Amino acid sequence: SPFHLNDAVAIVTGAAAGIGRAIAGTFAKAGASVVVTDLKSEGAEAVAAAIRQAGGKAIGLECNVTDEQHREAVIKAALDQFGKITVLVNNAGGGGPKPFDMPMSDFEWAFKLNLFSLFRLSQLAAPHMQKAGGGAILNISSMAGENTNVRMASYGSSKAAVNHLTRNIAFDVGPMGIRVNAIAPGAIKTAILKHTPLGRLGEAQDIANAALFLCSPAAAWISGQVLTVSGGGVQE
Amino acid sequence: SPFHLNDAVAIVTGAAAGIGRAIAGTFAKAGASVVVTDLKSEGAEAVAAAIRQAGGKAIGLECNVTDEQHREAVIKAALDQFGKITVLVNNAGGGGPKPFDMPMSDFEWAFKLNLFSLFRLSQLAAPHMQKAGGGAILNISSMAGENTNVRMASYGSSKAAVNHLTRNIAFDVGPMGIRVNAIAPGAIKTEIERAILKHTPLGRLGEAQDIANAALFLCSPAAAWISGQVLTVSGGGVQE
Numbered sequence: 001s002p003f004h005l006n007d008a009v010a011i012v013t014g015a016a017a018g019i020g021r022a023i024a025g026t027f028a029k030a031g032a033s034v035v036v037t038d039l040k041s042e043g044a045e046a047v048a049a050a051i052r053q054a055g056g057k058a059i060g061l062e063c064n065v066t067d068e069q070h071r072e073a074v075i076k077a078a079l080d081q082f083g084k085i086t087v088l089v090n091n092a093g094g095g096g097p098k099p100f101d102m103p104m105s106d107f108e109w110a111f112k113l114n115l116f117s118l119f120r121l122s123q124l125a126a127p128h129m130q131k132a133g134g135g136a137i138l139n140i141s142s143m144a145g146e147n148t149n150v151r152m153a154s155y156g157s158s159k160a161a162v163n164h165l166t167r168n169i170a171f172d173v174g175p176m177g178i179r180v181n182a183i184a185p186g187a188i189k190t191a192i193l194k195h196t197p198l199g200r201l202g203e204a205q206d207i208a209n210a211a212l213f214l215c216s217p218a219a220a221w222i223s224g225q226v227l228t229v230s231g232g233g234v235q236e
Numbered sequence: 237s238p239f240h241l242n243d244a245v246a247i248v249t250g251a252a253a254g255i256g257r258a259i260a261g262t263f264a265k266a267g268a269s270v271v272v273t274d275l276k277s278e279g280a281e282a283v284a285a286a287i288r289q290a291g292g293k294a295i296g297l298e299c300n301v302t303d304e305q306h307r308e309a310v311i312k313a314a315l316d317q318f319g320k321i322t323v324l325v326n327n328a329g330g331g332g333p334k335p336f337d338m339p340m341s342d343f344e345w346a347f348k349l350n351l352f353s354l355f356r357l358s359q360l361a362a363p364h365m366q367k368a369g370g371g372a373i374l375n376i377s378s379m380a381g382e383n384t385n386v387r388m389a390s391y392g393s394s395k396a397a398v399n400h401l402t403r404n405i406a407f408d409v410g411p412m413g414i415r416v417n418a419i420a421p422g423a424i425k426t427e428i429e430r431a432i433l434k435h436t437p438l439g440r441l442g443e444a445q446d447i448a449n450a451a452l453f454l455c456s457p458a459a460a461w462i463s464g465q466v467l468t469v470s471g472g473g474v475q476e
Binding site for chain 1: 304335336337340343344347351352355356359362381384385386387388389392393394396397399400401403404405406407408409464
Protein backbone atom coordinates (compact mmCIF):
# COMPACT_ATOMS: atom_id res chain seq x y z
CA SER A 1 0.00 0.00 0.00
CA PRO A 2 1.25 3.49 -0.87
CA PHE A 3 -0.15 4.91 2.37
CA HIS A 4 2.96 3.77 4.31
CA LEU A 5 6.31 5.47 4.87
CA ASN A 6 8.52 2.43 4.42
CA ASP A 7 12.25 3.25 4.50
CA ALA A 8 11.56 6.99 5.01
CA VAL A 9 13.54 9.34 7.25
CA ALA A 10 11.40 12.15 8.66
CA ILE A 11 12.47 15.26 10.58
CA VAL A 12 9.48 16.57 12.61
CA THR A 13 9.95 19.91 14.36
CA GLY A 14 8.04 21.34 17.33
CA ALA A 15 7.10 17.77 18.16
CA ALA A 16 7.11 17.64 21.99
CA ALA A 17 3.29 17.75 22.15
CA GLY A 18 -0.01 18.09 20.30
CA ILE A 19 0.01 17.95 16.49
CA GLY A 20 3.78 17.56 16.16
CA ARG A 21 3.95 14.65 18.62
CA ALA A 22 1.03 12.87 16.92
CA ILE A 23 2.68 13.28 13.52
CA ALA A 24 5.98 11.90 14.84
CA GLY A 25 4.34 8.86 16.44
CA THR A 26 2.10 8.24 13.41
CA PHE A 27 4.98 8.49 10.94
CA ALA A 28 7.03 5.99 12.96
CA LYS A 29 4.12 3.52 13.09
CA ALA A 30 3.89 3.91 9.31
CA GLY A 31 7.53 2.79 8.98
CA ALA A 32 9.52 6.04 9.12
CA SER A 33 12.65 6.58 11.14
CA VAL A 34 11.89 9.87 12.89
CA VAL A 35 14.14 12.71 14.02
CA VAL A 36 12.02 14.44 16.69
CA THR A 37 12.94 18.06 17.49
CA ASP A 38 11.55 20.60 19.89
CA LEU A 39 12.67 23.87 21.44
CA LYS A 40 12.93 21.86 24.68
CA SER A 41 15.48 19.04 24.66
CA GLU A 42 13.54 16.99 27.21
CA GLY A 43 10.31 17.24 25.22
CA ALA A 44 11.91 15.89 22.04
CA GLU A 45 13.72 13.12 23.91
CA ALA A 46 10.52 12.09 25.70
CA VAL A 47 8.73 11.62 22.36
CA ALA A 48 11.62 9.77 20.70
CA ALA A 49 11.86 7.39 23.67
CA ALA A 50 8.11 6.73 23.62
CA ILE A 51 8.39 5.90 19.90
CA ARG A 52 11.27 3.52 20.63
CA GLN A 53 9.42 1.78 23.50
CA ALA A 54 6.56 1.24 21.00
CA GLY A 55 8.88 -0.56 18.57
CA GLY A 56 9.81 2.34 16.28
CA LYS A 57 13.09 3.99 15.32
CA ALA A 58 13.61 7.56 16.49
CA ILE A 59 16.04 10.03 18.05
CA GLY A 60 15.22 13.29 19.78
CA LEU A 61 17.16 16.50 20.05
CA GLU A 62 16.81 20.15 20.90
CA CYS A 63 16.25 22.56 18.02
CA ASN A 64 15.50 26.26 18.18
CA VAL A 65 14.40 26.43 14.55
CA THR A 66 15.34 30.14 14.42
CA ASP A 67 19.01 29.27 15.15
CA GLU A 68 21.11 28.35 12.11
CA GLN A 69 23.54 26.15 14.07
CA HIS A 70 20.62 24.21 15.56
CA ARG A 71 19.11 23.78 12.09
CA GLU A 72 22.42 22.42 10.78
CA ALA A 73 22.77 20.12 13.80
CA VAL A 74 19.35 18.56 13.06
CA ILE A 75 20.28 17.87 9.42
CA LYS A 76 23.57 16.33 10.52
CA ALA A 77 21.94 14.22 13.24
CA ALA A 78 19.42 12.80 10.75
CA LEU A 79 22.17 11.86 8.27
CA ASP A 80 24.59 10.54 10.90
CA GLN A 81 21.91 8.36 12.49
CA PHE A 82 19.73 7.22 9.59
CA GLY A 83 21.80 7.95 6.48
CA LYS A 84 19.35 10.10 4.49
CA ILE A 85 16.48 12.59 4.73
CA THR A 86 13.26 12.04 2.77
CA VAL A 87 10.52 13.84 4.77
CA LEU A 88 10.48 17.22 6.55
CA VAL A 89 7.54 18.32 8.70
CA ASN A 90 7.83 22.00 9.64
CA ASN A 91 5.54 22.12 12.64
CA ALA A 92 7.45 24.56 14.83
CA GLY A 93 5.86 27.98 14.77
CA GLY A 94 3.85 30.23 17.02
CA GLY A 95 2.19 33.58 17.60
CA GLY A 96 -1.34 34.80 18.04
CA PRO A 97 -3.54 37.89 18.42
CA LYS A 98 -1.59 41.14 18.80
CA PRO A 99 -2.63 44.82 18.61
CA PHE A 100 -2.03 46.78 15.41
CA ASP A 101 0.41 49.05 17.30
CA MET A 102 2.58 46.13 18.48
CA PRO A 103 6.37 46.69 18.77
CA MET A 104 8.14 46.12 15.46
CA SER A 105 10.21 43.33 17.02
CA ASP A 106 6.99 41.34 17.64
CA PHE A 107 5.93 41.72 14.00
CA GLU A 108 9.37 40.69 12.69
CA TRP A 109 9.62 37.77 15.15
CA ALA A 110 6.42 36.27 13.71
CA PHE A 111 8.12 36.13 10.32
CA LYS A 112 11.41 34.73 11.67
CA LEU A 113 9.63 32.03 13.70
CA ASN A 114 6.81 31.06 11.32
CA LEU A 115 8.44 31.68 7.93
CA PHE A 116 12.20 32.30 7.79
CA SER A 117 12.86 29.22 9.96
CA LEU A 118 10.95 26.75 7.79
CA PHE A 119 12.23 28.25 4.53
CA ARG A 120 15.83 27.78 5.69
CA LEU A 121 15.22 24.25 7.00
CA SER A 122 13.66 23.46 3.61
CA GLN A 123 16.76 24.85 1.85
CA LEU A 124 18.94 22.69 4.11
CA ALA A 125 16.91 19.51 3.63
CA ALA A 126 16.30 19.80 -0.11
CA PRO A 127 19.73 18.69 -1.49
CA HIS A 128 19.70 15.55 0.69
CA MET A 129 16.12 14.84 -0.37
CA GLN A 130 17.26 15.14 -3.98
CA LYS A 131 20.19 12.77 -3.52
CA ALA A 132 17.84 10.25 -1.90
CA GLY A 133 15.68 10.30 -5.04
CA GLY A 134 12.90 12.58 -3.80
CA GLY A 135 10.99 13.60 -0.74
CA ALA A 136 8.09 15.45 0.80
CA ILE A 137 7.99 18.71 2.76
CA LEU A 138 4.93 19.44 4.90
CA ASN A 139 4.30 22.85 6.49
CA ILE A 140 1.83 23.14 9.38
CA SER A 141 0.20 26.50 8.77
CA SER A 142 -2.87 28.13 10.29
CA MET A 143 -6.43 28.85 9.24
CA ALA A 144 -5.48 32.48 10.01
CA GLY A 145 -3.41 32.33 6.82
CA GLU A 146 -6.56 32.57 4.69
CA ASN A 147 -8.96 34.34 7.06
CA THR A 148 -9.26 38.06 7.78
CA ASN A 149 -9.82 39.33 11.35
CA VAL A 150 -8.81 41.93 13.94
CA ARG A 151 -5.47 41.60 15.78
CA MET A 152 -4.03 39.40 13.00
CA ALA A 153 -1.43 41.75 11.51
CA SER A 154 1.58 39.54 12.33
CA TYR A 155 0.02 36.08 12.83
CA GLY A 156 -2.36 36.16 9.85
CA SER A 157 0.15 37.73 7.48
CA SER A 158 3.04 35.44 8.44
CA LYS A 159 0.86 32.33 8.07
CA ALA A 160 -0.41 33.62 4.73
CA ALA A 161 3.23 33.92 3.69
CA VAL A 162 3.73 30.28 4.75
CA ASN A 163 0.81 29.23 2.54
CA HIS A 164 2.12 31.17 -0.42
CA LEU A 165 5.71 30.03 0.12
CA THR A 166 4.35 26.46 -0.03
CA ARG A 167 2.70 27.08 -3.40
CA ASN A 168 5.70 28.84 -4.96
CA ILE A 169 8.61 26.68 -3.82
CA ALA A 170 6.68 23.65 -5.07
CA PHE A 171 7.78 25.00 -8.48
CA ASP A 172 11.43 25.28 -7.40
CA VAL A 173 11.84 21.87 -5.78
CA GLY A 174 9.50 19.76 -7.95
CA PRO A 175 12.37 19.25 -10.41
CA MET A 176 14.40 17.76 -7.53
CA GLY A 177 11.64 15.22 -6.89
CA ILE A 178 10.30 17.08 -3.92
CA ARG A 179 6.68 17.82 -3.08
CA VAL A 180 5.66 20.69 -0.80
CA ASN A 181 2.24 21.00 0.86
CA ALA A 182 0.66 22.57 3.94
CA ILE A 183 -2.06 21.71 6.45
CA ALA A 184 -4.16 24.35 8.18
CA PRO A 185 -5.70 22.74 11.31
CA GLY A 186 -8.97 23.67 13.00
CA ALA A 187 -9.34 23.52 16.79
CA ILE A 188 -8.06 20.30 18.43
CA LYS A 189 -8.63 18.75 21.87
CA THR A 190 -5.78 18.45 24.36
CA ALA A 191 -19.96 27.38 19.70
CA ILE A 192 -18.37 24.44 17.89
CA LEU A 193 -21.73 23.34 16.47
CA LYS A 194 -22.38 26.61 14.66
CA HIS A 195 -18.81 26.96 13.38
CA THR A 196 -18.01 23.26 12.73
CA PRO A 197 -20.37 21.40 10.35
CA LEU A 198 -19.20 17.96 11.56
CA GLY A 199 -20.17 19.01 15.08
CA ARG A 200 -17.09 17.94 17.06
CA LEU A 201 -13.64 19.18 17.97
CA GLY A 202 -10.74 17.73 16.05
CA GLU A 203 -8.14 15.30 17.37
CA ALA A 204 -4.39 15.53 16.88
CA GLN A 205 -4.69 12.15 15.16
CA ASP A 206 -6.92 13.74 12.50
CA ILE A 207 -4.13 16.16 11.59
CA ALA A 208 -1.53 13.37 11.68
CA ASN A 209 -3.62 11.19 9.35
CA ALA A 210 -3.74 14.00 6.77
CA ALA A 211 -0.02 14.56 7.31
CA LEU A 212 0.71 10.88 6.67
CA PHE A 213 -1.32 10.95 3.44
CA LEU A 214 0.44 14.07 2.12
CA CYS A 215 3.92 12.74 2.95
CA SER A 216 3.28 9.22 1.57
CA PRO A 217 3.57 7.77 -1.95
CA ALA A 218 -0.25 7.97 -2.11
CA ALA A 219 0.23 11.73 -2.63
CA ALA A 220 3.26 11.46 -4.91
CA TRP A 221 1.65 13.73 -7.53
CA ILE A 222 0.22 16.29 -5.04
CA SER A 223 2.29 19.44 -4.54
CA GLY A 224 1.71 23.08 -3.79
CA GLN A 225 -1.56 22.54 -1.88
CA VAL A 226 -2.96 23.97 1.37
CA LEU A 227 -5.32 21.42 2.95
CA THR A 228 -7.64 22.64 5.70
CA VAL A 229 -8.48 19.98 8.27
CA SER A 230 -11.22 21.63 10.29
CA GLY A 231 -14.41 19.57 10.29
CA GLY A 232 -15.72 21.67 7.43
CA GLY A 233 -15.32 24.89 9.37
CA VAL A 234 -14.03 28.07 7.75
CA GLN A 235 -13.40 30.14 10.89
CA GLU A 236 -11.58 29.41 14.14
CA SER B 237 -17.12 65.03 -7.23
CA PRO B 238 -16.38 62.34 -4.85
CA PHE B 239 -13.30 61.66 -6.96
CA HIS B 240 -11.30 64.63 -5.60
CA LEU B 241 -8.80 64.77 -2.73
CA ASN B 242 -9.59 68.26 -1.50
CA ASP B 243 -7.55 69.39 1.53
CA ALA B 244 -5.85 65.97 1.72
CA VAL B 245 -2.17 65.50 2.63
CA ALA B 246 -0.68 62.43 0.92
CA ILE B 247 2.66 60.72 1.54
CA VAL B 248 3.78 58.78 -1.57
CA THR B 249 6.93 56.65 -1.22
CA GLY B 250 9.34 55.45 -3.92
CA ALA B 251 7.91 58.15 -6.18
CA ALA B 252 10.81 59.47 -8.28
CA ALA B 253 9.69 57.45 -11.32
CA GLY B 254 7.09 55.04 -12.67
CA ILE B 255 3.91 54.30 -10.74
CA GLY B 256 4.82 56.35 -7.68
CA ARG B 257 5.58 59.46 -9.73
CA ALA B 258 2.27 59.20 -11.59
CA ILE B 259 0.32 58.77 -8.34
CA ALA B 260 2.00 61.82 -6.80
CA GLY B 261 1.24 63.93 -9.87
CA THR B 262 -2.35 62.72 -10.11
CA PHE B 263 -3.06 63.20 -6.39
CA ALA B 264 -1.71 66.77 -6.60
CA LYS B 265 -3.95 67.66 -9.55
CA ALA B 266 -6.86 66.20 -7.57
CA GLY B 267 -6.18 68.69 -4.74
CA ALA B 268 -3.85 66.85 -2.34
CA SER B 269 -0.70 68.34 -0.87
CA VAL B 270 1.91 65.65 -1.59
CA VAL B 271 5.04 64.53 0.28
CA VAL B 272 7.10 62.78 -2.42
CA THR B 273 9.77 60.43 -1.09
CA ASP B 274 12.38 58.32 -2.81
CA LEU B 275 15.68 56.64 -2.06
CA LYS B 276 17.26 59.31 -4.30
CA SER B 277 16.45 62.72 -2.82
CA GLU B 278 17.15 64.40 -6.17
CA GLY B 279 14.52 62.37 -8.01
CA ALA B 280 11.96 63.03 -5.28
CA GLU B 281 12.70 66.75 -5.41
CA ALA B 282 12.28 66.82 -9.20
CA VAL B 283 8.78 65.33 -8.98
CA ALA B 284 7.77 67.84 -6.27
CA ALA B 285 9.10 70.79 -8.26
CA ALA B 286 7.10 69.66 -11.31
CA ILE B 287 3.98 69.48 -9.12
CA ARG B 288 4.55 72.99 -7.76
CA GLN B 289 5.31 74.35 -11.24
CA ALA B 290 1.97 72.97 -12.52
CA GLY B 291 0.14 74.70 -9.66
CA GLY B 292 0.07 72.09 -6.87
CA LYS B 293 1.62 71.85 -3.40
CA ALA B 294 4.37 69.32 -2.72
CA ILE B 295 7.76 68.71 -1.16
CA GLY B 296 10.30 66.00 -1.93
CA LEU B 297 12.37 64.13 0.65
CA GLU B 298 14.93 61.37 0.82
CA CYS B 299 13.59 58.26 2.53
CA ASN B 300 14.99 54.77 2.81
CA VAL B 301 11.73 53.16 3.96
CA THR B 302 13.64 50.34 5.69
CA ASP B 303 15.36 52.79 8.06
CA GLU B 304 13.34 53.72 11.16
CA GLN B 305 14.96 57.13 11.49
CA HIS B 306 14.08 57.99 7.88
CA ARG B 307 10.50 56.76 8.44
CA GLU B 308 10.08 58.99 11.51
CA ALA B 309 11.61 61.99 9.72
CA VAL B 310 9.21 61.67 6.75
CA ILE B 311 6.18 61.56 9.06
CA LYS B 312 7.46 64.60 10.94
CA ALA B 313 8.27 66.47 7.72
CA ALA B 314 4.73 65.89 6.46
CA LEU B 315 3.26 67.35 9.65
CA ASP B 316 5.76 70.24 9.71
CA GLN B 317 5.04 71.14 6.07
CA PHE B 318 1.29 70.58 5.75
CA GLY B 319 -0.02 70.16 9.31
CA LYS B 320 -1.65 66.73 8.98
CA ILE B 321 -1.55 63.33 7.27
CA THR B 322 -4.64 61.85 5.63
CA VAL B 323 -3.30 59.56 2.83
CA LEU B 324 -0.35 57.14 2.76
CA VAL B 325 0.62 55.42 -0.48
CA ASN B 326 3.19 52.68 0.26
CA ASN B 327 4.67 52.39 -3.21
CA ALA B 328 8.30 51.78 -2.26
CA GLY B 329 9.32 48.16 -2.66
CA GLY B 330 11.50 45.89 -4.75
CA GLY B 331 12.78 42.44 -5.54
CA GLY B 332 12.03 39.88 -8.19
CA PRO B 333 13.04 36.41 -9.35
CA LYS B 334 15.60 34.64 -7.13
CA PRO B 335 16.71 30.99 -7.02
CA PHE B 336 15.41 28.68 -4.31
CA ASP B 337 18.89 28.47 -2.75
CA MET B 338 19.30 32.29 -2.33
CA PRO B 339 21.22 33.55 0.70
CA MET B 340 18.92 34.06 3.65
CA SER B 341 19.89 37.74 3.65
CA ASP B 342 18.10 38.07 0.27
CA PHE B 343 14.99 36.29 1.59
CA GLU B 344 14.86 38.44 4.72
CA TRP B 345 15.46 41.63 2.71
CA ALA B 346 12.35 41.08 0.57
CA PHE B 347 10.30 41.18 3.77
CA LYS B 348 12.23 44.11 5.25
CA LEU B 349 11.67 46.13 2.08
CA ASN B 350 8.25 45.00 0.81
CA LEU B 351 6.48 44.36 4.14
CA PHE B 352 8.11 45.56 7.38
CA SER B 353 8.62 49.05 5.96
CA LEU B 354 5.01 49.66 4.94
CA PHE B 355 3.61 48.10 8.11
CA ARG B 356 5.77 50.43 10.18
CA LEU B 357 4.89 53.48 8.10
CA SER B 358 1.20 52.54 8.50
CA GLN B 359 1.67 52.35 12.28
CA LEU B 360 3.33 55.78 12.29
CA ALA B 361 0.71 57.44 10.08
CA ALA B 362 -2.46 55.92 11.60
CA PRO B 363 -2.72 58.06 14.79
CA HIS B 364 -2.25 61.24 12.75
CA MET B 365 -4.91 60.11 10.25
CA GLN B 366 -7.36 59.51 13.09
CA LYS B 367 -6.69 62.93 14.62
CA ALA B 368 -7.28 64.45 11.19
CA GLY B 369 -10.73 62.82 11.02
CA GLY B 370 -9.94 59.77 8.91
CA GLY B 371 -7.71 58.63 6.13
CA ALA B 372 -6.78 56.06 3.52
CA ILE B 373 -3.77 53.78 3.23
CA LEU B 374 -2.95 52.29 -0.17
CA ASN B 375 -0.34 49.56 -0.64
CA ILE B 376 1.16 48.92 -4.07
CA SER B 377 1.60 45.15 -4.15
CA SER B 378 2.23 42.86 -7.18
CA MET B 379 0.36 40.17 -9.03
CA ALA B 380 3.04 37.80 -7.71
CA GLY B 381 1.18 37.94 -4.39
CA GLU B 382 -1.63 35.84 -5.83
CA ASN B 383 0.22 34.03 -8.65
CA THR B 384 2.45 30.99 -8.24
CA ASN B 385 5.66 30.48 -10.20
CA VAL B 386 9.27 29.37 -10.13
CA ARG B 387 11.86 31.70 -8.52
CA MET B 388 9.17 33.46 -6.45
CA ALA B 389 10.08 32.28 -2.93
CA SER B 390 10.95 35.73 -1.57
CA TYR B 391 9.10 38.06 -3.96
CA GLY B 392 5.84 36.11 -4.20
CA SER B 393 5.71 35.30 -0.49
CA SER B 394 6.50 38.86 0.61
CA LYS B 395 3.90 40.31 -1.75
CA ALA B 396 1.28 37.77 -0.60
CA ALA B 397 1.98 38.99 2.93
CA VAL B 398 1.30 42.58 1.82
CA ASN B 399 -2.06 41.51 0.39
CA HIS B 400 -3.05 39.66 3.56
CA LEU B 401 -1.70 42.40 5.81
CA THR B 402 -3.92 44.82 3.86
CA ARG B 403 -7.02 42.70 4.47
CA ASN B 404 -6.28 42.09 8.17
CA ILE B 405 -5.26 45.57 9.34
CA ALA B 406 -8.39 46.99 7.66
CA PHE B 407 -10.12 45.46 10.72
CA ASP B 408 -7.67 47.07 13.16
CA VAL B 409 -7.80 50.64 11.85
CA GLY B 410 -11.34 50.75 10.49
CA PRO B 411 -12.60 51.92 13.90
CA MET B 412 -10.07 54.80 13.71
CA GLY B 413 -11.70 55.93 10.46
CA ILE B 414 -8.93 54.57 8.21
CA ARG B 415 -9.40 52.44 5.10
CA VAL B 416 -6.63 50.14 3.84
CA ASN B 417 -6.55 48.82 0.28
CA ALA B 418 -3.98 47.52 -2.20
CA ILE B 419 -3.38 47.58 -5.94
CA ALA B 420 -1.65 44.73 -7.77
CA PRO B 421 -0.35 46.15 -11.08
CA GLY B 422 0.15 44.08 -14.20
CA ALA B 423 2.42 44.82 -17.17
CA ILE B 424 2.99 48.56 -16.78
CA LYS B 425 5.52 49.92 -19.26
CA THR B 426 7.84 52.58 -17.83
CA GLU B 427 8.61 40.96 -29.38
CA ILE B 428 8.42 40.47 -25.65
CA GLU B 429 5.48 42.75 -25.89
CA ARG B 430 3.86 40.15 -28.06
CA ALA B 431 4.18 37.56 -25.36
CA ILE B 432 2.69 39.84 -22.78
CA LEU B 433 -0.07 40.97 -25.14
CA LYS B 434 -1.17 37.44 -25.98
CA HIS B 435 -1.82 37.13 -22.23
CA THR B 436 -3.60 40.50 -21.94
CA PRO B 437 -7.26 40.37 -23.08
CA LEU B 438 -7.53 44.14 -23.58
CA GLY B 439 -4.63 44.06 -26.05
CA ARG B 440 -2.26 46.79 -24.80
CA LEU B 441 0.32 47.18 -22.08
CA GLY B 442 -0.70 49.12 -19.01
CA GLU B 443 0.31 52.73 -18.35
CA ALA B 444 1.43 54.31 -15.09
CA GLN B 445 -1.69 56.50 -15.34
CA ASP B 446 -3.95 53.43 -15.19
CA ILE B 447 -2.53 52.63 -11.74
CA ALA B 448 -2.75 56.30 -10.72
CA ASN B 449 -6.45 56.49 -11.69
CA ALA B 450 -7.22 53.43 -9.59
CA ALA B 451 -5.13 54.80 -6.71
CA LEU B 452 -7.04 58.09 -6.80
CA PHE B 453 -10.37 56.27 -6.71
CA LEU B 454 -9.34 54.10 -3.75
CA CYS B 455 -8.00 57.07 -1.76
CA SER B 456 -10.96 59.38 -2.49
CA PRO B 457 -14.41 59.84 -0.89
CA ALA B 458 -15.76 57.83 -3.85
CA ALA B 459 -14.36 54.78 -2.01
CA ALA B 460 -15.07 55.86 1.58
CA TRP B 461 -16.79 52.52 2.29
CA ILE B 462 -14.18 50.34 0.54
CA SER B 463 -11.54 48.70 2.73
CA GLY B 464 -9.49 45.52 2.82
CA GLN B 465 -9.52 45.08 -0.96
CA VAL B 466 -6.77 44.00 -3.35
CA LEU B 467 -7.56 45.49 -6.78
CA THR B 468 -5.70 43.93 -9.71
CA VAL B 469 -5.10 46.35 -12.61
CA SER B 470 -3.96 44.11 -15.43
CA GLY B 471 -5.93 44.56 -18.66
CA GLY B 472 -7.89 41.42 -17.83
CA GLY B 473 -4.77 39.31 -17.52
CA VAL B 474 -4.04 36.95 -14.66
CA GLN B 475 -0.42 36.08 -15.45
CA GLU B 476 2.84 37.77 -14.42
